[PDB]
Design a protein around this motif. Structure first.
Motif, PDB file in Angstrom:
ATOM      1  N   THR A  10       0.826  -1.221   0.000  1.00 31.22           N
ATOM      2  CA  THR A  10       0.000   0.000   0.000  1.00 31.22           C
ATOM      3  C   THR A  10       0.865   1.278   0.000  1.00 31.22           C
ATOM      4  O   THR A  10       0.490   2.329  -0.492  1.00 31.22           O
ATOM      5  CB  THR A  10      -0.977  -0.035   1.148  1.00 31.22           C
ATOM      6  N   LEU A  11       2.076   1.142   0.489  1.00 32.30           N
ATOM      7  CA  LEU A  11       2.988   2.282   0.494  1.00 32.30           C
ATOM      8  C   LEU A  11       4.146   2.082  -0.446  1.00 32.30           C
ATOM      9  O   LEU A  11       5.142   2.785  -0.346  1.00 32.30           O
ATOM     10  CB  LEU A  11       3.445   2.564   1.907  1.00 32.30           C
ATOM     11  N   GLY A  12       4.007   1.210  -1.424  1.00 30.50           N
ATOM     12  CA  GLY A  12       5.084   1.043  -2.371  1.00 30.50           C
ATOM     13  C   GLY A  12       6.272   0.219  -1.882  1.00 30.50           C
ATOM     14  O   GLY A  12       6.213  -0.515  -0.907  1.00 30.50           O
ATOM     15  N   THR A  13       7.364   0.339  -2.608  1.00 27.69           N
ATOM     16  CA  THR A  13       8.506  -0.485  -2.409  1.00 27.69           C
ATOM     17  C   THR A  13       9.760   0.341  -2.178  1.00 27.69           C
ATOM     18  O   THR A  13      10.850  -0.206  -2.140  1.00 27.69           O
ATOM     19  CB  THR A  13       8.700  -1.422  -3.612  1.00 27.69           C
ATOM     20  N   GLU A  14       9.622   1.650  -2.044  1.00 29.18           N
ATOM     21  CA  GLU A  14      10.800   2.494  -1.915  1.00 29.18           C
ATOM     22  C   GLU A  14      10.968   3.138  -0.549  1.00 29.18           C
ATOM     23  O   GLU A  14      12.075   3.396  -0.121  1.00 29.18           O
ATOM     24  CB  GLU A  14      10.752   3.566  -2.997  1.00 29.18           C
ATOM     25  N   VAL A  15       9.861   3.412   0.131  1.00 25.68           N
ATOM     26  CA  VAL A  15       9.857   4.181   1.329  1.00 25.68           C
ATOM     27  C   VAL A  15      10.776   3.521   2.372  1.00 25.68           C
ATOM     28  O   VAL A  15      10.809   2.313   2.465  1.00 25.68           O
ATOM     29  CB  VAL A  15       8.410   4.302   1.837  1.00 25.68           C
ATOM     30  N   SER A  16      11.563   4.300   3.097  1.00 24.29           N
ATOM     31  CA  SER A  16      12.324   3.731   4.214  1.00 24.29           C
ATOM     32  C   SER A  16      11.396   3.168   5.306  1.00 24.29           C
ATOM     33  O   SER A  16      10.197   3.518   5.433  1.00 24.29           O
ATOM     34  CB  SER A  16      13.268   4.803   4.819  1.00 24.29           C
ATOM     35  N   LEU A 206      -1.193  -6.212  -8.837  1.00 22.80           N
ATOM     36  CA  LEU A 206       0.037  -5.591  -8.318  1.00 22.80           C
ATOM     37  C   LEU A 206       0.267  -4.102  -8.627  1.00 22.80           C
ATOM     38  O   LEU A 206       1.303  -3.555  -8.208  1.00 22.80           O
ATOM     39  CB  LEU A 206       1.234  -6.420  -8.767  1.00 22.80           C
ATOM     40  N   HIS A 207      -0.680  -3.444  -9.315  1.00 19.89           N
ATOM     41  CA  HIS A 207      -0.458  -2.100  -9.804  1.00 19.89           C
ATOM     42  C   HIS A 207      -1.639  -1.175  -9.765  1.00 19.89           C
ATOM     43  O   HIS A 207      -1.440   0.025  -9.697  1.00 19.89           O
ATOM     44  CB  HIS A 207       0.077  -2.153 -11.244  1.00 19.89           C
ATOM     45  N   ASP A 208      -2.880  -1.698  -9.775  1.00 16.32           N
ATOM     46  CA  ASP A 208      -4.086  -0.857  -9.971  1.00 16.32           C
ATOM     47  C   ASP A 208      -5.333  -1.365  -9.241  1.00 16.32           C
ATOM     48  O   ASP A 208      -6.395  -1.563  -9.830  1.00 16.32           O
ATOM     49  CB  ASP A 208      -4.378  -0.690 -11.492  1.00 16.32           C
ATOM     50  N   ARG A 209      -5.213  -1.562  -7.944  1.00 19.32           N
ATOM     51  CA  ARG A 209      -6.348  -1.747  -7.036  1.00 19.32           C
ATOM     52  C   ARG A 209      -6.928  -0.400  -6.583  1.00 19.32           C
ATOM     53  O   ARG A 209      -6.243   0.628  -6.670  1.00 19.32           O
ATOM     54  CB  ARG A 209      -5.834  -2.453  -5.783  1.00 19.32           C
ATOM     55  N   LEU A 210      -8.194  -0.404  -6.127  1.00 14.85           N
ATOM     56  CA  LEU A 210      -8.879   0.747  -5.562  1.00 14.85           C
ATOM     57  C   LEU A 210      -8.957   0.642  -4.044  1.00 14.85           C
ATOM     58  O   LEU A 210      -8.782  -0.455  -3.432  1.00 14.85           O
ATOM     59  CB  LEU A 210     -10.291   0.900  -6.162  1.00 14.85           C
ATOM     60  N   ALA A 211      -9.248   1.773  -3.428  1.00 16.65           N
ATOM     61  CA  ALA A 211      -9.411   1.802  -1.970  1.00 16.65           C
ATOM     62  C   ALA A 211     -10.740   1.104  -1.578  1.00 16.65           C
ATOM     63  O   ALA A 211     -11.629   1.006  -2.447  1.00 16.65           O
ATOM     64  CB  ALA A 211      -9.357   3.259  -1.492  1.00 16.65           C
ATOM     65  N   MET A 245      -1.534   5.993  -6.618  1.00 17.01           N
ATOM     66  CA  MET A 245      -1.715   6.607  -5.309  1.00 17.01           C
ATOM     67  C   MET A 245      -0.382   6.871  -4.687  1.00 17.01           C
ATOM     68  O   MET A 245      -0.129   7.952  -4.202  1.00 17.01           O
ATOM     69  CB  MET A 245      -2.528   5.740  -4.358  1.00 17.01           C
ATOM     70  N   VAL A 246       0.503   5.879  -4.723  1.00 12.77           N
ATOM     71  CA  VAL A 246       1.870   6.078  -4.207  1.00 12.77           C
ATOM     72  C   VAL A 246       2.629   7.243  -4.858  1.00 12.77           C
ATOM     73  O   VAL A 246       3.361   7.958  -4.177  1.00 12.77           O
ATOM     74  CB  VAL A 246       2.723   4.754  -4.277  1.00 12.77           C
ATOM     75  N   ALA A 247       2.447   7.406  -6.173  1.00  9.13           N
ATOM     76  CA  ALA A 247       3.140   8.433  -6.953  1.00  9.13           C
ATOM     77  C   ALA A 247       2.612   9.779  -6.575  1.00  9.13           C
ATOM     78  O   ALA A 247       3.378  10.740  -6.549  1.00  9.13           O
ATOM     79  CB  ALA A 247       2.986   8.168  -8.448  1.00  9.13           C
ATOM     80  N   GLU A 251       1.565  10.047   2.176  1.00  2.97           N
ATOM     81  CA  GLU A 251       0.616  10.609   3.090  1.00  2.97           C
ATOM     82  C   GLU A 251      -0.757  10.534   2.480  1.00  2.97           C
ATOM     83  O   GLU A 251      -1.692  10.134   3.142  1.00  2.97           O
ATOM     84  CB  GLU A 251       0.976  12.061   3.443  1.00  2.97           C
ATOM     85  N   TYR A 252      -0.836  10.902   1.203  1.00  8.14           N
ATOM     86  CA  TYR A 252      -2.055  10.840   0.391  1.00  8.14           C
ATOM     87  C   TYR A 252      -2.610   9.437   0.388  1.00  8.14           C
ATOM     88  O   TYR A 252      -3.752   9.198   0.709  1.00  8.14           O
ATOM     89  CB  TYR A 252      -1.724  11.244  -1.022  1.00  8.14           C
ATOM     90  N   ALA A 253      -1.741   8.489   0.095  1.00  9.45           N
ATOM     91  CA  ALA A 253      -2.131   7.072  -0.013  1.00  9.45           C
ATOM     92  C   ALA A 253      -2.707   6.594   1.276  1.00  9.45           C
ATOM     93  O   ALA A 253      -3.803   6.046   1.299  1.00  9.45           O
ATOM     94  CB  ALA A 253      -0.922   6.222  -0.385  1.00  9.45           C
ATOM     95  N   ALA A 254      -1.919   6.806   2.338  1.00  9.60           N
ATOM     96  CA  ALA A 254      -2.278   6.415   3.688  1.00  9.60           C
ATOM     97  C   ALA A 254      -3.599   7.005   4.150  1.00  9.60           C
ATOM     98  O   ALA A 254      -4.455   6.270   4.678  1.00  9.60           O
ATOM     99  CB  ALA A 254      -1.173   6.827   4.663  1.00  9.60           C
ATOM    100  N   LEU A 255      -3.797   8.304   3.917  1.00  6.42           N
ATOM    101  CA  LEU A 255      -5.055   8.977   4.353  1.00  6.42           C
ATOM    102  C   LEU A 255      -6.239   8.429   3.559  1.00  6.42           C
ATOM    103  O   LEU A 255      -7.332   8.204   4.092  1.00  6.42           O
ATOM    104  CB  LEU A 255      -4.928  10.494   4.163  1.00  6.42           C
ATOM    105  N   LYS A 256      -6.021   8.219   2.264  1.00  2.00           N
ATOM    106  CA  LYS A 256      -7.111   7.859   1.372  1.00  2.00           C
ATOM    107  C   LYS A 256      -7.632   6.494   1.778  1.00  2.00           C
ATOM    108  O   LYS A 256      -8.851   6.292   1.922  1.00  2.00           O
ATOM    109  CB  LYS A 256      -6.631   7.835  -0.082  1.00  2.00           C
TER     110      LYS A 256
END
Ligand SMILES: [Mg+2]
Ligand SMILES: [Mg+2]
Ligand SMILES: [Mg+2]
Length: 275
Positions: A10-16, A206-211, A245-247, A251-256
């Motif tokens: 849900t938060l991608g693969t890059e975030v620390s 793996l790329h285009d699910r909805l909330a 969403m990640v792009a 914060e956007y992703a998480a809130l949404k």
């Protein structure tokens, strides 16, 4: 109790790791999910097991989901790296106090081979629960199939994950849960589906699910089915895998996805909705 968990993808693969924790915590989540890859990245960045525990504690957070074991169906698939990944998830679960590990089988092998391989995997897992996730494009294609093989393997730690995306894309209904003991469903993962499937379902997944509830997969009806069946999930994962969403923003992703999750559970299962 059921921790509302923001799943790894849900938060991608890059975030620390520390950003992952912080973004989760800031947005009302009780826990995060972690992929083995996320864990290896953290070690590569100079973080230790101990430091990860400290950071979680600093944010009043937990890792509540550990994933993802695959490539266990055949001798040729169970390479040294596969087995390393298995071992890594087992250690991660013990470290972070997680009781079950997410597992899927992409390879479409004969079911009698699946039963045997699954049994062996559960043996390897020892006290940890194997949460087998059916997926429409995989070797375990629907919930009845997942239960069939978990049942037949005869290990009590062979259990089941229901993820809204897979449920909706495998066209599951109320009848899908028939003869599945409620106490065999170890976790639930929430999200939703586009109206029109991708040509390649696995790409979509793996790329285009909805909330949750913002889509066409009746996330609300799905949650109500599992509730009424008497499922008691160990975690309520929120697994909305969306490059868009990640792009846009973590914060956007998480809130949404939090707001959407709260909307669905308020309606379907208020007692576990985040509050
Ligand atoms: Mg990517
Ligand atoms: Mg899933
Ligand atoms: Mg109660």
């Amino acid at each position: 109790k059921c921790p509302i968990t923001i799943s790894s993808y849900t938060l991608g693969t890059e975030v620390s790791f520390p950003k992952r924790v912080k973004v989760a915590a800031e947005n009302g989540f009780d826990g995060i999910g972690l992929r083995a890859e996320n864990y290896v990245d953290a070690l590569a960045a100079g973080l230790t097991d101990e430091d990860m525990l400290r950071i979680l504690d600093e944010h009043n957070m937990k890792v509540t989901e550990v994933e993802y074991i695959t490539q266990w169906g055949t001798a040729e698939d169970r390479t040294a790296e596969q087995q390393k990944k298995e071992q890594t998830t087992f250690h991660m679960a013990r470290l972070f106090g997680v009781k079950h590990i997410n597992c899927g089988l992409l390879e479409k092998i004969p079911e009698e081979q699946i039963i045997v391989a699954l049994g062996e995997l559960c043996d390897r897992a020892e006290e940890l629960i194997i949460g087998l996730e059916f997926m429409p494009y995989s070797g375990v294609a629907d919930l009845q199939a997942a239960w069939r093989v978990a049942e037949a393997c005869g290990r009590d730690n062979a259990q089941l994950i229901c993820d809204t995306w897979h449920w909706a894309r495998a066209n599951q209904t109320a009848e899908s849960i028939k003869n599945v003991p409620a106490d065999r469903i170890v976790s639930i993962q929430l999200c939703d589906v586009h109206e029109t499937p991708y040509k390649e379902l696995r790409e979509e997944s793996l790329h285009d699910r909805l909330a949750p509830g913002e889509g066409y997969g009746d996330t609300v009806g799905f949650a109500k089915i599992l509730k009424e069946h008497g499922v008691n999930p160990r975690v309520m994962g929120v697994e909305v895998i969306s490059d868009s969403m990640v792009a846009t923003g973590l914060e956007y992703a998480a809130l949404k996805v939090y707001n959407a999750t709260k909307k669905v559970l308020d309606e379907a299962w208020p007692e576990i909705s985040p509050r």
